[PDB]
Amino acid sequence: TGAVITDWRPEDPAFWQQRGQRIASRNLWISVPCLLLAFCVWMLFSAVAVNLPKVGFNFTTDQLFMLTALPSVSGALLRVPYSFMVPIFGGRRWTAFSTGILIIPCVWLGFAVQDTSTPYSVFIIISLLCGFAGANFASSMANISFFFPKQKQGGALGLNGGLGNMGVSVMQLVAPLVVSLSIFAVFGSQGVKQPDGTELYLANASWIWVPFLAIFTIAAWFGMNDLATSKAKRGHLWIMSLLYLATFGSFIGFSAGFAMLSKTQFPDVQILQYAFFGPFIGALARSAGGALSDRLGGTRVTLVNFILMAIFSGLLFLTLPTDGQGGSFMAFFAVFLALFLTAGLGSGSTFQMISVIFRKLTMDRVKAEGGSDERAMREAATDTAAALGFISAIGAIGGFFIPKAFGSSLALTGSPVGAMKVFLIFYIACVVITWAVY
Ligand SMILES: CCCCCCCC/C=C\CCCCCCCC(=O)OC[C@H](O)CO
Ligand SMILES: CCCCCCCC/C=C\CCCCCCCC(=O)O
């Protein structure tokens, strides 16, 4: 029952009832909180950048948007490499490592926000380091696919990735709470007197994850396992890439720059009180998207969803001050909730299609070729790990594009309309292209 498992036989019904299920279950429920904490670290600047002017920093609006968009750059670049790391180092060893190193940017960001002389380029580095957390998805999903290789075990991936995405809302909920409280005075936390008369501890938004990162690094080390087992069309790979970019990329893109966008359009509103609700119902709808796609088919769900994305991205224009005249935060917030909801739905819907193409179809193609059940699970798991690594990497681009588009549109034109036009054309194009592959 040691950490390294040399006897792994999922092709044996007896092994699974005796050893297999209990092992795979233990790994999943340590993988989920580790992945959840990664999504907390990944999107940290979505909440931190908003509070940066409140503590003395004078970065431009575009600079603040850039800080929220950059972790999706290093995240996208590292997801394909991360997808190959579990077979090399083992699920347990890599999970402990990929979670443990996330302590460094968290500690650093806490000290950076307490010094107003901290260069913007330092925040750039920290922002890029937070992107390492975003790459944890590809490794975490790859790991689960090996622990749950059987045909009926499809869903352990959706659960791991679904609960992982919850980390965005968790962080956007926890961060505004802890910054009002003084809890790390022992470690050198300094408060900044707000115009409200209250105190603001921006370091807490980052330092709060350090103990939890430490705990589940130890938990992954003593609780997870290393599978000592062998782990050996492109047209579909690009369609899924485009689909996952339009859906998940929208989800993670809106999650990164919503609070910043809301702050530029409605300065009076403390958006961090409600911002977490967006990614929350988005990650929640992700689970509904998979079952909906399985029932109604990937084509019908993707088509209708993209229609709604275009419509809701179109309604977003009506909720904006034009210029300094009118506008409705309530409508602005509600429409974005509709955009978060439809992005998460399509995210889970697209993900369900990925597993159908690269896991189930693969596992059944080898069987039809007379292949064993062991080889069936193996190829399906590795092909899924490799595909999802590529697909999620392309999908992460939206996490950079959307906030950067807003910042560029606001700087060049003094309005977010320019970025929203591009989004609308994109969604309309997605409707057309999805209708092309039909
Ligand atoms: C906090 C600064 C950044 C930290 C970056 C960490 C780098 C990740 C490398 C290994 C992770 C697992 C480390 C092992 C976890 C501790 C295990 C331990 O406490 O003891 C093990 C026992 O002695 C023997 O079985
Ligand atoms: C396989 C691709 C791996 C990508 C690794 C991404 C991690 C990069 C981390 C930071 C490196 C420093 C970036 C340079 C900052 C420039 C600051 C500036 O120009 O203003």
Numbering used by the authors: 11 to 242, 252 to 457
Per the authors:
NarK is highly expressed during anaerobic growth in the presence of nitrate, and plays a central role in nitrate uptake, while NarU has important functions during severe nutrient starvation or slow growth. In this work, we demonstrate that NarK is a nitrate/nitrite antiporter, using an in vitro reconstituted system. The overall structures of NarK in both the occluded and inward-open states adopt a canonical MFS-fold with 12 TM helices, with TM1–TM6 and TM7–TM12 forming the N and C bundles, respectively. The substrate-binding site is located at the interface between the N and C bundles, in the middle of the TM segment.
Each asymmetric unit of Crystals I and II contained one inward-open molecule, while in the asymmetric unit of Crystal III, there were two occluded molecules (Mol A and B). In the nitrate-bound occluded structure, we observed a strong electron-density peak in the substrate-binding site. The crystallization conditions for the occluded-state crystals (Crystal III) contained ammonium nitrate. Therefore, we assigned this peak as a nitrate ion. The nitrate ion is sandwiched between F147 and F267, and forms a π–π stacking interaction with the π electrons of their phenyl groups. In Site A, two oxygen atoms of the nitrate ion form a bidentate salt bridge with the NH1 and NH2 atoms of the R89 guanidinium group. In Site B, two oxygen atoms of the nitrate ion form a bifurcated hydrogen bond with the phenol hydroxyl group of Y263 in TM7. In layer C3, part of the N-terminal loop consisting of P20 and E21 forms van der Waals contacts with the cytosolic terminus of TM11, including D392, E393 and M396. These interactions between the N and C bundles tightly close the pathway to the cytoplasmic side to prevent the intrusion of water or other solvent molecules into the substrate-binding site. In each of three independent simulations starting from the occluded state with the bound nitrate, no large structural change in the overall conformation was observed during the 250-ns simulation, suggesting that the overall structure of the occluded state is stable in the lipid bilayer environment. In the nitrate-bound occluded state, the negative charge of the nitrate in the substrate-binding site relaxes the electrostatic repulsion between the two positively charged arginine residues (R89 and R305), thereby enabling these two arginine residues to be in close proximity in the low-dielectric intramembrane environment.
